[PDB]
Design a protein around this ligand. Structure first.
Ligand SMILES: O[C@@H]1[C@@H](O)[C@H](O[C@@H]2CO[C@@H](O)[C@H](O)[C@H]2O)OC[C@H]1O
Ligand SMILES: O[C@@H]1[C@@H](O)[C@H](O[C@@H]2CO[C@@H](O)[C@H](O)[C@H]2O)OC[C@H]1O
Ligand SMILES: O[C@@H]1[C@@H](O)[C@H](O[C@@H]2CO[C@@H](O)[C@H](O)[C@H]2O)OC[C@H]1O
Ligand code: NA
Ligand code: NA
Length: 330
């Protein structure tokens, strides 16, 4: 049956989260997390998010029938990964498809790996080791108009980004949150140009600067605006849009810049808070319309770790601003 007409759950037979949407072969492919009711301890490091595999979803139209393509990748088959298959993304280059995924290695350190397929629907064969120089979570691999591909990544708190300031992991007794200096600039997400073969980074990883409207860095104490997780990049009318989740304040917000590396100037809210703690999205153009894919905990009766993906239309104004979406109004 067709789904996606009035902000209803796109699928109900499994729990789904963290929708990363792409247009491949004239269809929308969605690369979400597959939530399961593991019953694992709940805490601020996110041990209750104990996902173990990915299912790729696809739609030929919006609204439209959603196809579940089965298990595309299983943690038991990723040699380096021990637990927690968190939010993935995909990219397409030269007839191959690449699935990028965060997971904990055997030392309990989040890394980002790649798995390869001949189809956007998978299944995917993981590389035996994670990407060299990767760390933390939430990859978004963005193909720019010039054919260059960039990975945006990172997440604080349970995502461990705050433990990577020196190029070495600070350790399991290091900060559980951020820099713990609220008057310093907040931690920014990470970016690296991808290698030609899509399996590695082509440069040393860089940090993205996010500034306010006056050009001042967004500060660590500014939880309404500072980066938490779920970086996403899209382009509209020559402007680069960095959007992300603010975590403990539950917003998707956005900031604009003139190139992939920024700096990005904070503009406003994309999506107000949803049912459940997390908020995670993607923004994609399909048949000349822009869509915001997102999730909430509505299907599970409000359980933060059992989510369902949803979609709605997103409106850019010609001046580059985006209309804020409130999830439960229309
Ligand atoms: O110190 C403990 C770690 O050993 C544990 O890390 C897990 C070990 O098993 C691996 O298969 C997993 O990838 C890894 O996360 O995490 C908890 C910590 O107390
Ligand atoms: O890494 C992130 C975790 O740090 C985050 O943990 C949340 C922190 O606030 C608590 O009130 C929530 O219960 C807990 O889920 O969860 C998301 C994860 O990506
Ligand atoms: O147009 C206005 C901006 O000038 C304003 O910028 C704020 C100025 O004070 C700083 O401390 C803030 O960080 C910065 O956002 O933002 C609101 C807007 O109406
Ligand atoms: Na993302
Ligand atoms: Na707004």
């Amino acid at each position: 049956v067709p789904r996606g007409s009035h902000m209803e759950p796109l699928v109900t037979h499994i729990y789904t989260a963290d929708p990363s949407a792409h247009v491949f072969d004239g269809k929308v492919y969605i690369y979400p997390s597959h939530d399961i009711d593991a019953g694992t301890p709940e805490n601020d490091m996110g041990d209750h998010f104990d996902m173990r595999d990915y299912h790729v979803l696809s739609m030929n139209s919006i609204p439209g029938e959603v196809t579940d393509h089965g298990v595309a990748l299983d943690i038991k088959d990723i040699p380096w990964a021990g637990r927690q298959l968190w939010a993935p993304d995909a990219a397409s280059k030269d007839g191959k498809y690449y699935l990028y995924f965060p997971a904990k290695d055997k030392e309990d350190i989040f890394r980002i790996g790649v798995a390869v397929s001949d189809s956007p629907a998978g299944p995917f064969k993981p590389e035996s080791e994670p990407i060299k120089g990767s760390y933390s979570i939430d990859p978004a691999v963005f193909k720019d108009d010039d054919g260059k591909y960039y990975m945006y990544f990172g997440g604080i708190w349970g995502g461990q980004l705050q433990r990577w300031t020196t190029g070495e992991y600070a350790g399991h007794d290091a900060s559980k949150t951020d820099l713990e200096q609220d008057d310093a600039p907040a931690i920014g997400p990470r970016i690296a140009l991808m290698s030609d073969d899509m399996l590695s980074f082509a440069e040393p990883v860089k940090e993205i600067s996010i500034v306010d409207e006056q050009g001042n860095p967004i500060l660590g104490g500014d939880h309404d605006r500072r980066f938490f997780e779920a970086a996403w990049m899209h382009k509209y009318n020559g402007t680069y849009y960095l959007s992300y989740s603010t975590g403990d304040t539950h917003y998707i917000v956005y900031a604009t810049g003139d190139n992939p590396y920024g700096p990005f100037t904070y503009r406003g809210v994309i999506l107000n808070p949803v049912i459940g703690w997390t908020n995670h999205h993607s923004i994609v153009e399909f048949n000349g319309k822009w869509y915001l894919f997102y999730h909430d905990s509505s299907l599970s009766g409000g359980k933060t770790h059992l989510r369902c993906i949803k979609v709605t239309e997103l409106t850019h104004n010609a001046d580059g601003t985006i209309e804020t979406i409130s999830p439960y109004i229309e």
